[PDB]
Amino acid sequence: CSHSMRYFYTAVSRPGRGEPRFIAVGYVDDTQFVRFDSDAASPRGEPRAPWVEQEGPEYWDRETQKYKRQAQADRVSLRNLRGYYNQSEAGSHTLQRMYGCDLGPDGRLLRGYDQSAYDGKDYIALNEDLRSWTAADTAAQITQRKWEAAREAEQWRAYLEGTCVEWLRRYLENGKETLQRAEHPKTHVTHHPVSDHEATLRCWALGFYPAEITLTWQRDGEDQTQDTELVETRPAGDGTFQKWAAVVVPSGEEQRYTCHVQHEGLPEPLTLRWEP
Template sequence: MQSPRCCLLSLLLYLFLLSGTWANLEGAFTLRLLQTTTFQNTSFTDMEGLGLLEDIELGCLDKHTWSIHFCQPWVRPALPHVDWDTIENLLKVYLQKFRHLINEGAMQRDIPYPFVVQCMAGCVLYSNRTSQAFAYVGYNGQDFLSFDTENVTWTLSQDTELSRYVQSFLQNYTALNELVEIIFNDTCADEMEVFLQYGRTAFPVPSPPCQPLSHVGAFTLRLLQTTTFQNTSFTDMEGLGLLEDIELGCLDKHTWSIHFCQPWVRPALPHVDWDTIENLLKVYLQKFRHLINEGAMQRDIPYPFVVQCMAGCVLYSNRTSQAFAYVGYNGQDFLSFDTENVTWTLSQDTELSRYVQSFLQNYTALNELVEIIFNDTCADEMEVFLQYGRTVLERQELPVATVFTRTPSLDQLLLVCHVTGFYPRPISVAWLRDGQEVPPGPALNTSTILPNADLTYQLRSVLAVAPRDGHSYVCRVRHHSLGTRSLLIPWGNSEVVLITGLVAGLLAAVAVAAMSVLWVWRQRKHQQMEESESRNSILSREA
């Protein structure tokens, strides 16, 4: 039995084994292939796929025909038509085998339906043409396995009986693992350049200015920084700017320069302003690294450790704003900044947190600068990004909801409402029992909102009930894209409603047919009577 990964990698091999010229683009570029598959039961599977070069959608999977929909006009010309035909055929074979093997494994291991499998693979290509590969597998929204391309091994992201079984299954495919290692570590730097060559004009294209955004609700701007201090000499820094869930820009960890993730971000400010910001950013990161290392040595803090910083503001529709700033240490909340009182407050009371609090509190100029930036200028400056990114921010995708059941035991029935494909992220999903909303309790379990491969979201709400309890149940979905309407998806009576509708439609069709036959019959009868009268009149004249 062939592993589904072999088919996927055959497809990737066709994608990567191309010839092209280096696009002379600076910085790092990431190619990601995303696949999300929802196994509702052994018969019904919902598959979604997406290819991304940075944040640019190259192509997506048609979930009905499993064909490739090209999202950019320059993607199809990057390969001959015969190659795309081969890729589509391989893709369909892969998806069929993937679905079959997963269902077969689920039945062998008694895995309860429904469940979701997510796969992400790709590589990062740096300006010096070195590359770093990655491959991850998720199960029900949780990290499950990852592929170590250096050691050619699958590593556990969670240690469970199921993950160990899948790890062992994949690890035994030596040829598969070697193929993954070759594709991502050896050929990515050479072959991804063809897409950069064909799509180079897609990166610097500016968006024209538009009218001020008439937004409803609130928008949040977040600046994230994660720094791993391996020792006094080596520090790994990562940075990201987000407007809601949209990536504005990220930090190049090698050059500390800004990589713009949206084509409309750079035009939002003059070039001279971006140059100033980059220079200030580099000075800040140098001082940040120096001061943290200095403090760590003074306080005998053991290496390695991780420092996380998040700062930003929420802008409301009345143009008032609320700022926030947080510091984390080794994944735990550490300090937060009170912008109203211009003070640092403890999130955990330890000797180290009190030392850092005292250290920061003595920087009066720093605290006043933070207070001014976030409380005074956020409402004015963030609106520039809202104006330039209006089209992206106002994107709306309608939710698609399905209701099905699971029976974990004879005395319990689980009603599952699965909602997917919606954007923006906020959504309301509730169960109605006999028209009344079911309150929160142990019988109701709603998952967190999870991302899909096509940059939309999904979640599920599960309600435990007794079989044949005599009540009617409806899943209600409210979302901004629906306006004042709601999606109502019934369970139980839905088949009756469907059958009644079919019978009513059939009766209506019969009635229409009967009326049509009667009308035709009357028309013919009337015509025959006229012809008979005409003949009688002629005979009487002849007589």
């Protein structure tokens, strides 16, 4: 139903060791389609999904030119930011920007993003109305005043409501086989004796797309949370994701425990037990 196109820019200064590195990656939902790395042997915008490989050399040359200009712009930004904070010339600093457009459950523009962090902390963000800004401190209000004179929110509203959703829809169509067909999790439950009277039950979800998923444990149909561990959802490397949830249980009560799986690719939520 809902879909997103999201870009992630990272600029890292390294004084005395060259000019700042700039890396850009772009995604549709949880699938990467483009990268650019100023430190690459031959920096260029590069396809990372098959459904942008037919865009043509003109498209890719234009994305490459944008990234090269963007890297120099982020370098200027890093110099300006160091000045705002009266920071020394020798320290390394990080500038991150995330932006993009979220289509809602109707396939129309629901939310646009344009937010930035400096050295890992919120710096300035375009608000959901796409007309106002949240600035974190006095340095960010310097940036905000410059952007307001440029009608920055207006330009970003234009991109977010136009180019961003237009090309997101194009990518979604060209790759609809892999972007608009959720892949359900493949599940199983494992068992490990912990002691002479307790055991671990681990509920697995593999091979699913998109990454969003919920795994929970129940006992006699009652939620079990105090002694349940969840690992962070992790990429399998083939475009799908993995997760598991483990609970420690008194030995002999395993058959009373149920794992509950919710995922977009399932018709209804899934209930699982251990099969000895």
